[PDB]
Amino acid sequence: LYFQHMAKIGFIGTGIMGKPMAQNLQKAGHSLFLSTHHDAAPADLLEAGAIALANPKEVAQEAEFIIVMVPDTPQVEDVLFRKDGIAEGAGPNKVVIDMSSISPTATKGFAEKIKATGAQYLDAPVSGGEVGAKAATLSIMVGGCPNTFERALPLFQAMGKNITRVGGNGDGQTAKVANQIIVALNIQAVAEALLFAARNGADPAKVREALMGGFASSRILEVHGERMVKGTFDPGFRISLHQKDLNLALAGARELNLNLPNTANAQQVFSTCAAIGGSNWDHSALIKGLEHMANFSIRDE
Amino acid sequence: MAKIGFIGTGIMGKPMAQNLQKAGHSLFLSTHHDAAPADLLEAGAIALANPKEVAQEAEFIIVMVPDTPQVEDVLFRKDGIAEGAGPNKVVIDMSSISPTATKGFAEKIKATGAQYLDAPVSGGEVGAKAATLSIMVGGCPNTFERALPLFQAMGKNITRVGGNGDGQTAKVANQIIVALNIQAVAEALLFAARNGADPAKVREALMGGFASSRILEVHGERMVKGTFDPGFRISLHQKDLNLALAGARELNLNLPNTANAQQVFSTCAAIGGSNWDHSALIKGLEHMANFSIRDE
Amino acid sequence: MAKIGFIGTGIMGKPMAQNLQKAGHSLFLSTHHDAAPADLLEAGAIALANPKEVAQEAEFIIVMVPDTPQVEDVLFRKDGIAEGAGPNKVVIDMSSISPTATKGFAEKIKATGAQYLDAPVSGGEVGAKAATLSIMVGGCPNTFERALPLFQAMGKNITRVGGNGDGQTAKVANQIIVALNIQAVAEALLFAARNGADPAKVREALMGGFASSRILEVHGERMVKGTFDPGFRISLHQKDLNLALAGARELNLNLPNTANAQQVFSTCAAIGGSNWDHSALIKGLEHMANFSIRDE
Amino acid sequence: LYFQHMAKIGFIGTGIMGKPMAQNLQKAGHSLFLSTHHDAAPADLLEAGAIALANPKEVAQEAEFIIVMVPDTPQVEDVLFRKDGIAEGAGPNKVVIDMSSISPTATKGFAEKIKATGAQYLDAPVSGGEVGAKAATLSIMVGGCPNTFERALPLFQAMGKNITRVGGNGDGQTAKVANQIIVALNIQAVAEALLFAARNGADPAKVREALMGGFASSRILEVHGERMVKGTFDPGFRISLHQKDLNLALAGARELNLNLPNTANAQQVFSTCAAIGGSNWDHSALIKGLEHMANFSIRDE
């Protein structure tokens, strides 16, 4: 309830997701604090009043909330615990919110190390992509203390639509890995289906249009399915990043004794995509690896 | 408007036939296989001896039986649909059968003067009752336009994919997505529960994002709640996946997820689950991990 | 000793029949399908019009044709083996066909007074020529003992697995191992070559250890040297894997490696390889990695 | 040729493989030097004249050749580069021979760091198991300088039968990963086949006996195949260790863009084995996970 008042929020990682999320936080009337350590602060954010400090430590000192939107597990560790990082600037009454898609197992240790400074920790990765981040319609899956979650909820509301506390620390990251298994497999599912249909001489565009509103309907079918048919593979979410995400699921499966045959196989098909020069294609281009495997394309190009 | 015949008034047939009556259509049932549903009789449907006498009377004849042999038999056996079909009549196969055989059945039906549409559906018993099924159709555009108002009374998203066989192909493609989407939710929820997270909260958390699907909404809820009473039985989906895998072998396709999904349904069948709803694919993966996402 | 009939003197049949002559057996060929190999004729083999006249003359009738329908036809068609078979005659199916259908064919052959053994082989064209084939047999122990000296002339490791059908089951199991062992060597060599290591040296290095196999020795050498001219064609092994995958679906078995191997052979077929020797499964995996273990 | 003269060889890691290999080196007339840092020297080796020093550094100082037989990649790094490790005791005219089954990619870096001390490096992992180690019939696949290889060849001859220089540093480890892909997949192959045969009512013992001498013949069929039928799963090579090995193949596949569907799937089936309490069963017990998946056992117990 309280954060209808201005909030002091630091934002570490202003990428294709971080920049629109920080922009949306500023539109809800909040004060943004940036780190210029790796990259210069975007002029869009400086114009809206963001204070560009020199490093994550200084950011953690000025701000009450510190959001991290970086690519992977080792980068969160470095940003949190390197010299002049978030832990050195954190203490009581401060909330460190990792919105990156990292290891759930590692997150538990990061949460303990941050809480050892008197600060609180939330793991709140998102779903919805760049389009979702700009629209503030992201699904935010949170892991942490229920009072910390409620305290940070008005901020999550400015960045997303469905916000949910899955459980304690590590759970928000476990919810993002589960998301990542679904996303990658729903893509593989639509690709195999359209490849089968087009191989039998059925127009894949008509097939995808016909499946909407039934048991095969999904956001992947309407979004990725259209990209597969139209060949619009310009990265939204790179195959190299989804391979990083599936590695978390498969590492978890190895440690916790899970037999996930389709998650294991989507990782192999993503490698066919990379082998034909596709690490930086959007993950919808997973169809191109299946087309390579079939010696048949669903497109006329 | 229109007199309609209906062979196969089962779990999907009866509610689809019921919605045709409400729309102002006269129905003609066949009591050769079994007795006509009293609900339909009490509402105006005429019972007839066989699909030939039904075809003779009706201008539109819908078929809804379990597999390719059963469609073949009801179309071309003695006293079947073809014998009573002819000029101006339209045969509509709304069953989910082999796209390959459909082109042959359509050819033989057209040889009587009649027309043929292959219009399988998606949306389960629920969607048939509520008339929100997605109906994928293959056949002549003029023939599709004639049957379109009947399709509108049975479903919501109606679409002509292409010529004859293309409707059945869209259905195989649908069954690949249904099985693989069910396995994605099962693998994802088993990963979550195994990590100590609540699968009920994870399912709720993923709504509105890229992981959003009709499967996460319906079948995902069944996985969390343990509600596996058949809507669509595993033994039936295994038959649907065989159509895809036979077609992939014939057309030189490498579909590894679909192939894995067939092997997983086999584990479900081995542990006593041939008649569970296809959402119980999670039970096969759960067995594979010696760990269930639910209690007791 | 013994008069022997031989239907199917092809790539495997002709050398097996040849070795029976050398052992002191009189052969009876059928010229219904095609002309008798001149090599066999010049060595004493009598040509006859059909498998019935061959069965009438011989006490042992060996069959070696490509699949289940072809065995069914040659056994039970007009002028086939059954018509001329009877008391004291023994039908030996050395083809690799469905274990399921074999029990039915055996039952129908016994109904003539004759006996039946299902004795498929392993060891390729090479092993047939050199008489070192491993012969897996199903049937009556007394019937197996009668045919044993003939088996000894055609192969080296002779074994009765069980009753009728068990020989064919051992062959399906053999084909699962052959395909999966070929894919293990292909995946292993592709991993090695991809890491900049010489696949020729890696194959040599692995001999004598736990990775030692007949496949690493024969098929591994073909993968390194690029010698993919058929011994056993991919389209044939795909049919063999379908027997295993149909049986797994029927018996509620989850065989994920075998299922993956079938999907990989499909990539080989898509890139023009239906007639390559099964060692060219590496070519499918190589295509899947955009990287070949050989040059040019 | 020269090492028909006594050699000074250090042995770091005296496990189920290390102890018989060190014993066989001593029977060829060589001097063994042990480290008592983690474990006490086995009395079998001390009786044959092994000098038990205090740590890998001291061992590298006294011996000309230093063999390492430890479980995995991080343990080789620790043994080679920790305080009082092999690198601190190494210099010119010294050969460090890693016989462990570790990452080929990491090995290249370990080789460079060791060569920076004036010492030479060989990566010579083996195949043949405990039975092979005792019999000195192991297949030794070596990676390194051809002169270093020839110099160390009489020592490899006392420990094994087929010794081969695959290539330069990293290649011996790449040859062991290729070995590990074959071993795990040949086991999965025999298990699926015997499970299929037994499911159809054919005696699996007769089936395995029938397949020998044909295209399905292998060491896995004669060795592991008999264990599958007889249920003798007492560890020779633990499933947990083969899962470590397949992780190297799958990590390599992810980095180098390989689609290896059966290596990926054997890793999932090994997890079913672990899930039912099998991390310490012999890898032949991979059949038990397939039996769990089929709800059917090939045995009467």
Numbering used by the authors:
A (entry chain A), D (entry chain A): -4 to 296
B (entry chain B), C (entry chain B): 1 to 296
How does the study describe this entry?
We also show that the purified proteins encoded by PA1502 and PA1500 have glyoxylate carboligase (Gcl) and tartronate semialdehyde (TSA) reductase (GlxR) activity, respectively, in vitro. Gcl condenses two molecules of glyoxylate to yield TSA, which is then reduced by GlxR to yield d-glycerate. GlxR displayed much greater specificity (kcat/KM) for Gcl-derived TSA than it did for the TSA tautomer, hydroxypyruvate. P. aeruginosa GlxR was a tetramer in solution, whereas Hyi formed a dimer.
GlxR was crystallized from drops containing 0.1 M sodium acetate (pH 4.5) and 25% (w/v) polyethylene glycol smear medium and from drops containing 0.1 M Tris-HCl (pH 8.5), 20% (w/v) polyethylene glycol smear high and 20% glycerol. The resulting X-ray structures were designated the α and β forms, respectively. The structure of the α form was solved to 2.07 Å resolution and the structure of the β form was solved to 2.21 Å resolution. Both conformers contain an N-terminal domain comprised of nine α-helices surrounding a core of nine β-strands, and an exclusively α-helical C-terminal domain. By contrast, the oligomeric arrangement of the β form tetramer adopts a more open, expanded structure. However, when we superimposed the individual α and β protomers, they had a very similar structure, indicating that the differences in quaternary structure are primarily due to rigid body rearrangements of the protomers. Given that inter-protomer contacts in both the α and β forms of the enzyme are mediated through interactions between the C-terminal domains, this rigid body movement can be thought of as a rocking motion around a C-terminal pivot point. Interestingly, and although the α conformer is more ‘compact’ than the β conformer, the distance between the serine –OH and the lysine –NH3+ was larger in GlxRα (5.3 Å) than it was in GlxRβ (4.6 Å). Given that the GlxRβ tetramer is also structurally more similar (cf. the GlxRα tetramer) to the GarRSty tetramer, these data suggest that the GlxRβ conformer is likely to be more physiologically relevant. By contrast, the GlxRβ conformer – at both the protomer and tetramer level of organization – was a better fit than GlxRα with the X-ray crystal structure of a GlxR homologue, GarRSty.
